Amino acid sequence: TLSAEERAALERSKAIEKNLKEDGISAAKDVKLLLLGAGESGKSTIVKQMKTGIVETHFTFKNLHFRLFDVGGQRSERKKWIHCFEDVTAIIFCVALSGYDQNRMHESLMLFDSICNNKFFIDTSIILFLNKKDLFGEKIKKSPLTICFPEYTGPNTYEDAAAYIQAQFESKNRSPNKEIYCHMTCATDTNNIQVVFDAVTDIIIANNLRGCGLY
Amino acid sequence: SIAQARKLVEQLKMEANIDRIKVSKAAADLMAYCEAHAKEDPLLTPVPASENPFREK
Amino acid sequence: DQLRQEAEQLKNQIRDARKACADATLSQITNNIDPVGRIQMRTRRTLRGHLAKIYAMHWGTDSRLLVSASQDGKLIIWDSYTTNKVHAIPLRSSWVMTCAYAPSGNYVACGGLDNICSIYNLKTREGNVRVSRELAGHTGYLSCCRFLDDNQIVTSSGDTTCALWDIETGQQTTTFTGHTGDVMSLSLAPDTRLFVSGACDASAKLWDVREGMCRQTFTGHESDINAICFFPNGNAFATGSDDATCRLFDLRADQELMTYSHDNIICGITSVSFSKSGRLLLAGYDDFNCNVWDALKADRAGVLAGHDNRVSCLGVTDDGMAVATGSWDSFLKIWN
Amino acid sequence: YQVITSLLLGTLIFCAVLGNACVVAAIALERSLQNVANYLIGSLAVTDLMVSVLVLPMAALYQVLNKWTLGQVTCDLFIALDVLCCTSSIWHLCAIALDRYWAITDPIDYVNKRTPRRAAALISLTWLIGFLISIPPMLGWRTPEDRSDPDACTISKDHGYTIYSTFGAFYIPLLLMLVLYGRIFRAARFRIRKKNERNAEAKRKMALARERKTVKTLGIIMGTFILCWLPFFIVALVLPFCESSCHMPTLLGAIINWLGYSNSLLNPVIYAYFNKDFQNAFKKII
Numbered sequence: 105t106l107s108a109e110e111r112a113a114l115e116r117s118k119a120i121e122k123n124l125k126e127d128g129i130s131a132a133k134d135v136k137l138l139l140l141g142a143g144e145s146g147k148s149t150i151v152k153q154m155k156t157g158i159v160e161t162h163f164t165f166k167n168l169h170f171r172l173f174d175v176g177g178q179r180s181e182r183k184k185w186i187h188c189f190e191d192v193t194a195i196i197f198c199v200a201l202s203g204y205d206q207n208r209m210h211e212s213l214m215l216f217d218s219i220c221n222n223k224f225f226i227d228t229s230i231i232l233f234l235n236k237k238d239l240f241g242e243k244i245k246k247s248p249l250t251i252c253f254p255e256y257t258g259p260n261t262y263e264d265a266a267a268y269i270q271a272q273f274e275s276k277n278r279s280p281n282k283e284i285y286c287h288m289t290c291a292t293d294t295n296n297i298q299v300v301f302d303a304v305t306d307i308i309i310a311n312n313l314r315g316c317g318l319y
Numbered sequence: 320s321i322a323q324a325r326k327l328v329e330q331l332k333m334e335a336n337i338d339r340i341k342v343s344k345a346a347a348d349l350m351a352y353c354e355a356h357a358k359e360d361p362l363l364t365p366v367p368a369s370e371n372p373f374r375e376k
Numbered sequence: 377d378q379l380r381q382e383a384e385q386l387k388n389q390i391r392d393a394r395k396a397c398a399d400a401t402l403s404q405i406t407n408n409i410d411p412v413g414r415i416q417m418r419t420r421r422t423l424r425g426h427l428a429k430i431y432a433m434h435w436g437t438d439s440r441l442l443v444s445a446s447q448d449g450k451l452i453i454w455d456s457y458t459t460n461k462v463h464a465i466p467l468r469s470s471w472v473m474t475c476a477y478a479p480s481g482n483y484v485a486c487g488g489l490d491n492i493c494s495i496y497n498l499k500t501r502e503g504n505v506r507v508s509r510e511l512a513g514h515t516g517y518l519s520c521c522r523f524l525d526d527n528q529i530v531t532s533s534g535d536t537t538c539a540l541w542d543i544e545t546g547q548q549t550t551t552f553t554g555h556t557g558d559v560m561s562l563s564l565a566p567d568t569r570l571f572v573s574g575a576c577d578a579s580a581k582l583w584d585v586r587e588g589m590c591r592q593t594f595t596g597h598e599s600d601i602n603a604i605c606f607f608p609n610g611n612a613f614a615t616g617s618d619d620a621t622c623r624l625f626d627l628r629a630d631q632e633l634m635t636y637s638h639d640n641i642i643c644g645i646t647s648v649s650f651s652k653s654g655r656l657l658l659a660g661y662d663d664f665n666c667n668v669w670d671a672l673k674a675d676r677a678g679v680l681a682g683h684d685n686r687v688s689c690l691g692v693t694d695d696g697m698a699v700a701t702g703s704w705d706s707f708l709k710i711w712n
Numbered sequence: 713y714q715v716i717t718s719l720l721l722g723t724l725i726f727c728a729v730l731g732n733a734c735v736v737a738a739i740a741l742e743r744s745l746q747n748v749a750n751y752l753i754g755s756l757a758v759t760d761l762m763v764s765v766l767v768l769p770m771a772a773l774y775q776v777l778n779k780w781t782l783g784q785v786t787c788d789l790f791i792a793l794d795v796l797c798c799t800s801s802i803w804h805l806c807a808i809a810l811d812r813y814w815a816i817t818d819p820i821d822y823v824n825k826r827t828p829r830r831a832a833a834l835i836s837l838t839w840l841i842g843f844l845i846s847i848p849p850m851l852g853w854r855t856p857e858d859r860s861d862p863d864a865c866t867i868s869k870d871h872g873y874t875i876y877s878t879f880g881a882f883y884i885p886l887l888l889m890l891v892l893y894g895r896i897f898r899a900a901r902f903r904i905r906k907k908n909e910r911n912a913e914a915k916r917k918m919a920l921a922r923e924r925k926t927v928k929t930l931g932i933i934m935g936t937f938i939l940c941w942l943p944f945f946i947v948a949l950v951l952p953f954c955e956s957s958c959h960m961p962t963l964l965g966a967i968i969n970w971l972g973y974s975n976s977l978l979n980p981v982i983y984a985y986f987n988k989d990f991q992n993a994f995k996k997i998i
């Protein structure tokens with residue numbers, strides 16, 4: 105048997121429990137993405153296209169709600185806050201192609217290797233966005249590519265040089281059930297958000313196929 | 320570079336000019352606390368089920 | 377470059393003074409103590425309602441109510457006696473790594489990847505918990521916050537600094553600098569006139585709240601320290617690190633006393649805590665288990681298995697009646 | 713002789729009631745296994761458990777004693793429970809196929825409007841279709857000649873009911889699954905197809921291995937269903953219509969009937985005991 109006070113306590117508990125459930129349903133329908141990369145890599149440009157510590161930009165595109173967490177303002181050891189983002193659907197990585205001469209590219213290559221090989225991000229797919237494609241294209245004419253990579257034995261032409269940097273980036277992946285989606289950022293069109301959308305829809309389908317046993 | 324080295328030296332100086340006691344004495348005091356408040360440790364010494372508020376109140 | 381050599385001479389002086397003051401290990405003196413024996417604890421309650429990994433918790437001063445925080449942006453105040461939910465505060469930021477319960481029970485605080493500590497007034501005029509004050513000024517994720525009293529609070533962040541705040545004004549009255557790395561833990565003395573902090577540089581320090589100066593530094597670990605706790609006497613503390621080993625330091629002796637390590641354990645410690653009499657040391661691990669140690673002997677006296685995932689938080693009531701442990705599977709458990 | 717038959721049939725019934733039960737239990741205990749997909753796999757196990765405790769035991773008696781020794785009322789109950797509980801089991805496999813199809817073809821629906829209420833609706837429809845086949849003979853569509861012999865417990869051989877009951881229990885389900893799983897195969901192939909040279913050849917090899925996996929898995933699913941229930945349902949469409957000059961050997965009859973009733977022992981294995989999540993949960997429990 106319950107007294108008046110004990111009964112009112114159970115009533116309060118049940119109202120809270122109802123809200124807690126409703127909020128959980130409407131928060132499992134968002135696609136959560138981690139924005140990484142170097143400081144002046146072109147993270148800014150991607151944030152702008154989608155619109156102190158962590159900055160969250162949420163947007164709706166084609167009946168699918170996205171949330172993009174930027175952690176560029178967290179100057180600390182990556183280890184101690186990288187486990188918090190284990191559940192993310194994909195990682196968006198920004199690389200400044202034209203920054204190799206100014207090496208900045210070598211720093212980016214190292215960060216990429218690390219986030220591919222973390223025990224928490226073994227299968228989380230990466231969507232790579234190679235920025236400043238036009239600025240790269242005009243400057244390789246004068247200042248070559250062999251300066252950054254002595255191994256480069258190919259000619260200094262836009263297509264071949266950009267494709268070299270891409271194959272070199274895709275080589276760090278050493279695990280299946282994990283794909284890298286590289287794309288040279290296309291001006292200020294809605295093509296950039298389309299690349300994120302297509303990649304997300306492809307990793308949803310792949311996951312379902314694996315559950316059935318057909319992938 | 321020089322200022323922070325001065326800071327380090329002065330701090331280390333302070334952490335050397337303190338009065339320390341022999342581990343034997345320190346250790347005996349910790350042991351004494353644990354055997355003069357031992358009757359009051361429900362986790363250490365299982366509590367009667369009537370007085371356990373997380374089973375039968 | 378001569379200050380370097382002077383500092384290195386001072387290092388040697390300190391080392392030799394500690395060696396002189398060492399005469400007999402705690403193990404020798406407490407050999408005569410009869411073993412505590414097998415301590416077999418069985419979960420009494422299981423609190424459910426978090427839908428994501430629990431990162432922190434804190435018992436109330438009355439030994440009945442407990443706060444908990446998880447990555448789903450919820451701060452739920454439970455009632456361990458009957459498992460009734462008394463509050464559910466929605467966080468403006470889901471990324472929470474610490475929570476605290478005021479000694480008077482009138483407030484709670486939290487923080488995380490957002491470099492801010494928020495204070496919530498539990499008991500207000502309209503009966504609606506809102507954000508009263510938000511304290512900004514840290515440049516890194518807040519890792520621990522402890523209510524010094526109903527008007528002051530102490531926090532440690534990832535910028536390698538700890539600060540003392542004035543909740544009424546919101547400006548950090550004092551700042552404690554000196555750590556070489558991230559500050560991961562923090563513990564107040566029973567008198568609340570001193571506190572200790574553990575950093576990723578594998579060292580611990582003793583701070584004076586009134587003066588804001590580091591009294592002593594302790595360096596025995598081989599990796600970063602994740603948890604720290606004062607001995608109930610107030611004259612010693614225990615630390616846990618990724619080295620998979622705990623250690624006990626004594627302030628007056630100014631050096632390590634014992635070590636709690638096993639060859640069968642290779643995973644790190646997420647949290648440590650003591651009992652009411654100080655005879656037990658409960659430590660959470662990454663092997664999904666919690667081990668009970670004999671603080672006076674360094675011999676395991678139990679194992680609190682029952683969690684699916686890593687044990688992230690752990691605590692003991694003021695009256696010592698029960699111990700609660702959270703985990704990355706979003707389940708709290710009172711053991712007793 | 714009859715001792716041997718009793719033992720063997722007793723083993724089939726025992727293994728079935730054990731297997732199905734474990735699957736039902738694991739879901740209720742481990743909150744890991746509580747998603748829309750695992751609910752439909754669990755409701756298959758519940759339907760097969762009901763077959764194993766109501767239908768199978770009485771059918772084994774009719775086989776060993778080679779006569780119906782339970783009475784005319786019990787006879788009608790058996791026939792009605794047999795049709796209801798085995799119509800549901802075949803249509804549960806089409807519910808799993810339809811849920812799987814929507815997930816591979818519509819990614820947006822999967823995230824948003826895929827509910828645990830969808831599971832309930834699919835489960836309810838399987839049992840509805842069941843009743844619609846079993847109710848007609850019990851009230852209407854029944855000849856006195858069928859119940860002329862109290863020593864026999866036989867289904868209505870009315871040519872009308874034969875078409876209604878045989879098509880709407882096995883032939884229509886078969887076509888539906890063949891089409892749905894056919895399109896899942898097409899979709900799978902599309903995705904599979906769409907120092908660094910070492911990586912390149914590892915990619916071309918993973919594609920070939922995944923192509924082999926998508927053939928094997930569909931083979932086990934469609935194969936089990938067809939080789940278990942099809943031998944039965946060919947006979948049960950031809951024989952009623954071709955009354956004279958079509959003597960079934962007594963032996964053949966028994967074999968094909970119980971080959972069918974053995975799908976309620978293989979359905980637990982193919983759908984639950986093979987997937988990783990269930991295996992892992994069983995290791996945690998035991």
Ligand SMILES: CC(C)CCC[C@@H](C)[C@H]1CC[C@H]2[C@@H]3CC=C4C[C@@H](O)CC[C@]4(C)[C@H]3CC[C@]12C
Pocket residue numbers: 720723724727981
């Ligand atoms: C006549 C009745 C009573 C026999 C009951 C035994 C059953 C449970 C046995 C006999 C045949 C067995 C199957 C034979 C083939 C395979 C493939 C292999 O990878 C092992 C699993 C699996 C799928 C077995 C599962 C268990 C199984 C179905």
Ligand SMILES: CC(C)CCC[C@@H](C)[C@H]1CC[C@H]2[C@@H]3CC=C4C[C@@H](O)CC[C@]4(C)[C@H]3CC[C@]12C
Pocket residue numbers: 927928929931932934935936937939940978
């Ligand atoms: C239901 C019981 C009695 C029998 C179970 C196995 C039956 C259904 C047989 C008949 C046809 C068989 C398939 C025929 C061909 C292939 C393709 C091969 O690359 C892998 C094995 C696989 C996929 C076989 C698996 C077993 C199979 C499905």
Ligand SMILES: CC(C)CCC[C@@H](C)[C@H]1CC[C@H]2[C@@H]3CC=C4C[C@@H](O)CC[C@]4(C)[C@H]3CC[C@]12C
Pocket residue numbers: 717720721724775963966967970971972974975977978
């Ligand atoms: C691995 C599992 C699924 C295999 C299942 C095998 C089943 C179909 C086998 C095992 C024992 C068999 C029975 C054994 C003996 C008899 C008696 C005979 O006068 C008629 C057939 C009958 C009644 C058999 C029917 C088929 C049967 C039930």
Ligand SMILES: CN1C[C@@H]2c3cc(Cl)ccc3Oc3ccccc3[C@@H]2C1
Pocket residue numbers: 794795796798799802845867874877878881882941948969972
């Ligand atoms: C031995 N029984 C016969 C019975 C059945 C017979 C006819 Cl002709 C049509 C429908 C039937 O219901 C189903 C439905 C699906 C599977 C088996 C059966 C069972 C198996």
